[PDB]
Coordinates of C-alpha atoms and ligand atoms in Angstrom, one line a residue:
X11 CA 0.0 0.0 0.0
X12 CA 2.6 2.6 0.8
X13 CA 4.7 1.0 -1.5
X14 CA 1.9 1.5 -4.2
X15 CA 1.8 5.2 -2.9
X16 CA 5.5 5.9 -2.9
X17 CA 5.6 5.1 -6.9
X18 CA 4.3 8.6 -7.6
X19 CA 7.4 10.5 -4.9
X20 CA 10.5 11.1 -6.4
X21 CA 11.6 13.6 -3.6
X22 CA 10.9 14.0 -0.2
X23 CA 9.9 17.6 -1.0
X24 CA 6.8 16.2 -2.6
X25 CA 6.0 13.7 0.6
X26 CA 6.1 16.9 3.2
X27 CA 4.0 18.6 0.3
X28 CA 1.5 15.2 0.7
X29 CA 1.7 15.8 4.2
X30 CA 0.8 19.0 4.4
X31 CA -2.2 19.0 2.0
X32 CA -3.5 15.9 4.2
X33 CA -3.9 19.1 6.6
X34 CA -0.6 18.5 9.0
X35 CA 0.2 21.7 10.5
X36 CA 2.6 23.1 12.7
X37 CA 4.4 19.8 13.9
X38 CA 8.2 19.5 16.5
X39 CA 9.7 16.4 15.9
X40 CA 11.3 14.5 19.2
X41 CA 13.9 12.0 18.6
X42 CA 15.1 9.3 20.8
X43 CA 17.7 6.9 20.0
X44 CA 18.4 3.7 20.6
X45 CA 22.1 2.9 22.3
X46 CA 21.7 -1.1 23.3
X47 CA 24.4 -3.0 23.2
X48 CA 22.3 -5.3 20.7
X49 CA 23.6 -3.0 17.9
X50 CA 27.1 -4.5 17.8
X51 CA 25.5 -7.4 15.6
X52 CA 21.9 -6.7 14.3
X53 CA 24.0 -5.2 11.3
X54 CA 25.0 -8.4 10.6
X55 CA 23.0 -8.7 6.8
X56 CA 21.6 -4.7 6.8
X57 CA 24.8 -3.1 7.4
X58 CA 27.8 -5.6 6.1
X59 CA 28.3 -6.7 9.6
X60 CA 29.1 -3.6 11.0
X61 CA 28.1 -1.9 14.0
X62 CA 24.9 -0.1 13.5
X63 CA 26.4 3.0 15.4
X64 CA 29.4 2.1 12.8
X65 CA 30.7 5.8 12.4
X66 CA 32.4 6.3 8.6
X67 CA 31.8 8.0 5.2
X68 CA 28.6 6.5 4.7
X69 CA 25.6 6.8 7.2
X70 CA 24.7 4.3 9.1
X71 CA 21.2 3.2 10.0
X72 CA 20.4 5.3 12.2
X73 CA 22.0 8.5 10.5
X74 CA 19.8 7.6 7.3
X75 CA 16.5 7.5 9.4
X76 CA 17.2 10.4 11.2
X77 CA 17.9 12.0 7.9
X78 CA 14.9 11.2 6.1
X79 CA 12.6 12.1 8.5
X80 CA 14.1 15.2 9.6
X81 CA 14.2 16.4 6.2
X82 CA 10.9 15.5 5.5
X83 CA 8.9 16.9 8.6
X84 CA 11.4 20.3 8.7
X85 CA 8.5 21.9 6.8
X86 CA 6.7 21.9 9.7
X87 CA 8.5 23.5 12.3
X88 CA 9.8 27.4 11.7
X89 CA 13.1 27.2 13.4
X90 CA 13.3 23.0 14.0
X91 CA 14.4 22.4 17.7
X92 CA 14.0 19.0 18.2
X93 CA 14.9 17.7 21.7
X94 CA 16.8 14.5 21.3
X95 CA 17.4 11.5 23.7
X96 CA 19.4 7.9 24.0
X97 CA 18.7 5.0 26.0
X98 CA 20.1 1.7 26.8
X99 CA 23.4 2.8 27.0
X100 CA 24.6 2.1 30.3
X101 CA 23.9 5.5 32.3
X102 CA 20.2 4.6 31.5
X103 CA 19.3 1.1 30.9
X104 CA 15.5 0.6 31.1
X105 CA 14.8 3.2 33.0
X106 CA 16.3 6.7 32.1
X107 CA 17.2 8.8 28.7
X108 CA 19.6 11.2 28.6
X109 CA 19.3 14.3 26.8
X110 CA 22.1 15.0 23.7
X111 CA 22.8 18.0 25.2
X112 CA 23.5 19.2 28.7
X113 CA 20.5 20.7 30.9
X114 CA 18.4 18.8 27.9
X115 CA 18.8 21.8 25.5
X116 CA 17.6 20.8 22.3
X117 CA 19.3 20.3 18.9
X118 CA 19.2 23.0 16.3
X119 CA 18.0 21.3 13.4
X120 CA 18.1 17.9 12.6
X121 CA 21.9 18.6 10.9
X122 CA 23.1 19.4 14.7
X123 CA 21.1 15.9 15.6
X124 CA 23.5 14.3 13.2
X125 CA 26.7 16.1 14.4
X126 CA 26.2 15.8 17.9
X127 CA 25.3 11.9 17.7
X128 CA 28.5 11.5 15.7
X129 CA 30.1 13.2 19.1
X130 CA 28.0 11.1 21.6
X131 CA 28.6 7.9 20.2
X132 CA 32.0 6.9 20.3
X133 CA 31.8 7.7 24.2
X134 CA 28.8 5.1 24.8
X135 CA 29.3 2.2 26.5
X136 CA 26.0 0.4 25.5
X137 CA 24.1 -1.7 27.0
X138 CA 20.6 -2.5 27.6
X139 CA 17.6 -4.3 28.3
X140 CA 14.9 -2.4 25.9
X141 CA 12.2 -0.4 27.0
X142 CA 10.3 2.9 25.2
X143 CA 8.6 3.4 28.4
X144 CA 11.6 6.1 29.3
X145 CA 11.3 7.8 25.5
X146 CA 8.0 7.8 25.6
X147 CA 7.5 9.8 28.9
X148 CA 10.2 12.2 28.3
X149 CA 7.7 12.8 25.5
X150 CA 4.9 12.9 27.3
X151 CA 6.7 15.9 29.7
X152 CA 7.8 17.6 26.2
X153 CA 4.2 18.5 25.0
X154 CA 3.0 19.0 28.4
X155 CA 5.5 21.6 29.3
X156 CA 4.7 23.3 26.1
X157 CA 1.2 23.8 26.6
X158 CA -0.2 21.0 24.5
X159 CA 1.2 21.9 21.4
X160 CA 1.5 18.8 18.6
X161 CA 4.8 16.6 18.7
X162 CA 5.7 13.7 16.8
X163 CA 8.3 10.9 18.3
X164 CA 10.5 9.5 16.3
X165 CA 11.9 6.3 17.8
X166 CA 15.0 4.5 16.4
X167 CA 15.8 1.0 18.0
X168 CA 17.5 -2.2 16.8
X169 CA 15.1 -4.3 18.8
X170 CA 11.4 -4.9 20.2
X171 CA 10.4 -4.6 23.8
X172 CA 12.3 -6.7 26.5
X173 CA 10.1 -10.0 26.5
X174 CA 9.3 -12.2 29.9
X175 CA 11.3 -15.2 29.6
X176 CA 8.2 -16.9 30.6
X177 CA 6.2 -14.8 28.3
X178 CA 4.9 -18.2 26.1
X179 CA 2.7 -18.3 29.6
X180 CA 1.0 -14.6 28.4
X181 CA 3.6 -13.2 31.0
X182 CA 4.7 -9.7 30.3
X183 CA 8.1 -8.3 31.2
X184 CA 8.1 -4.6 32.7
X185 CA 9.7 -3.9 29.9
X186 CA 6.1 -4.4 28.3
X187 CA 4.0 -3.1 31.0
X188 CA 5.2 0.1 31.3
X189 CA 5.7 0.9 27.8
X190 CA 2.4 -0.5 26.7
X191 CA 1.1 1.4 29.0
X192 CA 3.4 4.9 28.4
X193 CA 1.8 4.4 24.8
X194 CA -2.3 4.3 26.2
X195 CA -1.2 7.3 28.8
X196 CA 0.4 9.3 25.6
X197 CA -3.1 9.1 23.7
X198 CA -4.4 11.8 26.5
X199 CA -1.6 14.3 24.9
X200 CA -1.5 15.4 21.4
X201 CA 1.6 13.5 20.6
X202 CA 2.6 10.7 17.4
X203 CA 4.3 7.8 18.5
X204 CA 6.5 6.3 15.4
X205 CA 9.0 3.3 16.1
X206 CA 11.4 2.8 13.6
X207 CA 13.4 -0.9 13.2
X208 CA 16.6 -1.0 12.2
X209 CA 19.3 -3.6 11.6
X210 CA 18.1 -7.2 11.2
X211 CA 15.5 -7.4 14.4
X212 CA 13.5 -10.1 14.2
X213 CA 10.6 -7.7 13.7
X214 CA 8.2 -9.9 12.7
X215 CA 6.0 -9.5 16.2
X216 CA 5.6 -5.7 15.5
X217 CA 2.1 -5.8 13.6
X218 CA 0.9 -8.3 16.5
X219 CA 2.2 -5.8 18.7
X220 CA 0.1 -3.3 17.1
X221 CA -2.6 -5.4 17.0
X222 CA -3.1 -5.7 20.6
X223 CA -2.2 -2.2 22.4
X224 CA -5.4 -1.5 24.1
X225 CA -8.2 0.7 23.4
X226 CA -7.2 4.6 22.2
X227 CA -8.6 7.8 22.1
X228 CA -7.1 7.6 18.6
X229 CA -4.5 5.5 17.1
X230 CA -1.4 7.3 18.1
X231 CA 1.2 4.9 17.5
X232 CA 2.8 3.3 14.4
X233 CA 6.1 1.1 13.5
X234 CA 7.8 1.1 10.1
X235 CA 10.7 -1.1 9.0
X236 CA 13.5 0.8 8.0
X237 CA 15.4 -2.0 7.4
X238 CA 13.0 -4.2 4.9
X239 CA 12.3 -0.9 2.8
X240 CA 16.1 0.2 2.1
X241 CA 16.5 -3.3 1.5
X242 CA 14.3 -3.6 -1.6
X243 CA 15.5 -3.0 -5.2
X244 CA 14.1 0.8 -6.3
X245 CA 16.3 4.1 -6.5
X246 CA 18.0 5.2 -3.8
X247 CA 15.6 8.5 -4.1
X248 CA 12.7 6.0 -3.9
X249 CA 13.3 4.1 -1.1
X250 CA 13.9 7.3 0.9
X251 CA 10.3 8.5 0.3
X252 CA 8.8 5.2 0.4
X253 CA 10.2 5.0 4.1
X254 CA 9.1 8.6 4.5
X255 CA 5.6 7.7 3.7
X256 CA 5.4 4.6 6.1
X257 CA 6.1 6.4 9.0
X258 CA 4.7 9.5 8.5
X259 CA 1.6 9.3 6.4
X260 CA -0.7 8.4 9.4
X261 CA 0.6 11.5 11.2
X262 CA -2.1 13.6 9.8
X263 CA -4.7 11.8 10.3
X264 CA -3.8 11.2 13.9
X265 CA -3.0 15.5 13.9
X266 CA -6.8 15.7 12.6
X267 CA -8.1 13.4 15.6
X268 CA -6.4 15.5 18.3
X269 CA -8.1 18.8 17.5
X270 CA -11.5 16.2 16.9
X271 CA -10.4 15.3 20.7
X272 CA -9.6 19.1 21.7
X273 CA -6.5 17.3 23.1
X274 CA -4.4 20.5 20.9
X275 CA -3.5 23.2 22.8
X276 CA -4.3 22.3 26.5
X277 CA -2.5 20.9 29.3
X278 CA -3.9 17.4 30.4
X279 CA -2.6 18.0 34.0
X280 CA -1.8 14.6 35.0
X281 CA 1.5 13.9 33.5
X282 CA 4.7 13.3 35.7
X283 CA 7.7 15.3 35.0
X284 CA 10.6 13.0 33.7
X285 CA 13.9 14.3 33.9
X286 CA 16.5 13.7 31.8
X287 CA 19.7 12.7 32.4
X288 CA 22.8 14.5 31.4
X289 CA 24.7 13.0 27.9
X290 CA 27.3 10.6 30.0
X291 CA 30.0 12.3 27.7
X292 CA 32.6 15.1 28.2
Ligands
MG301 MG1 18.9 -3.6 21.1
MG302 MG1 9.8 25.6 16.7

């Protein structure tokens, strides 16, 4: 279907274009970046065995993603501050982000994401297990703290949620509670939820996933495969907007259904203030 779409996009120009006319408006992009330990080998067929924090010439996974979507949703923002995040390094785990920059002030542009990951990196030690709960209420504070306006999170991990080892028994890990239930508490916010896979997964659970978060004010999250779209035999040009369109053409629908909700503009009241830690860098 998006693939079907994406035959008619030759630049991303024309996707924000799409988006726009689909009647997204003023829109901040959040980013939060996966930093597990995990990503040392889930490059092993999408990125010629490399790391997938692999720094070089050429970007890597994550530097392509961030990329693409920054580029595309740039429209949308006047002067593009975008607050960025890692986790599952080891000064967070499961449980924390950290901001990219100290006291968590946000990135200028999605070209100043790129540079100061590049920076960050190389001083990780990463580590794990994987939860979005963390990512997901740092983005929950984010639009609270600015008065309800609309956000979209982009998420970039190599990995689904940390399973119960006993989960063939329909047990959940925390790992699962809390961020299944960090995406139900987000639908009370105006505020997109977009997972992006990268490296090699397994991702095959995703749509299940999906499937079965519970009931929603509006649908406010979605998952796109990075990984399985770059990896397809089209124009470099067209992969880019094919992967533009699969995680982002739901986002103004789900814009629409927050003003439908009066969710825009307002403060919900009820959301705890996560703090961030500071980048474990120097
Ligand atoms: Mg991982
Ligand atoms: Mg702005």
């Amino acid at each position: 279907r998006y693939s079907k779409i994406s035959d008619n996009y030759s630049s991303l120009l024309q996707v924000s274009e799409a988006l726009g006319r689909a009647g997204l408006e003023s829109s901040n992009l959040i980013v939060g970046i996966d930093f597990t330990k995990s990503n040392e080998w889930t490059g092993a067929k999408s990125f010629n065995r490399k790391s997938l924090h692999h720094l070089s010439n050429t970007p890597n996974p994550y530097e392509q993603a961030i990329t693409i979507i920054g580029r595309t949703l740039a429209a949308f923002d006047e002067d593009n501050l975008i607050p960025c995040y890692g986790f599952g390094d080891a000064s967070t785990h499961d449980q924390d982000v950290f901001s990219f920059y100290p006291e968590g002030r946000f990135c200028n542009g999605f070209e100043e994401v790129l540079a100061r990951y590049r920076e960050i990196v190389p001083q990780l030690k990463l580590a794990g297990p994987t939860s979005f709960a963390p990512i997901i209420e740092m983005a929950m504070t984010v639009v609270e703290q600015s008065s309800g306006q609309y956000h979209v999170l982009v998420i970039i991990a190599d990995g689904q949620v940390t399973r119960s080892v006993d989960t063939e028994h329909g047990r959940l890990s925390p790992q699962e509670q809390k961020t299944v239930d960090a995406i139900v508490k987000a639908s009370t916010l105006p505020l997109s939820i977009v997972l992006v896979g990268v490296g090699d997964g397994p991702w095959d659970m995703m749509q299940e996933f999906a499937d079965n978060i519970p009931a929603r004010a509006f649908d406010n999250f979605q998952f796109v495969n990075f990984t399985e779209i770059m990896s397809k035999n089209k124009d470099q040009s067209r992969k880019e907007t094919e992967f533009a369109l699969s995680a982002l053409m739901e986002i103004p629908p789900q814009y629409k259904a927050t003003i439908e909700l009066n969710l825009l503009g307002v403060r919900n009241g009820n959301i705890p203030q996560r703090i961030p830690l500071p980048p474990p860098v120097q």
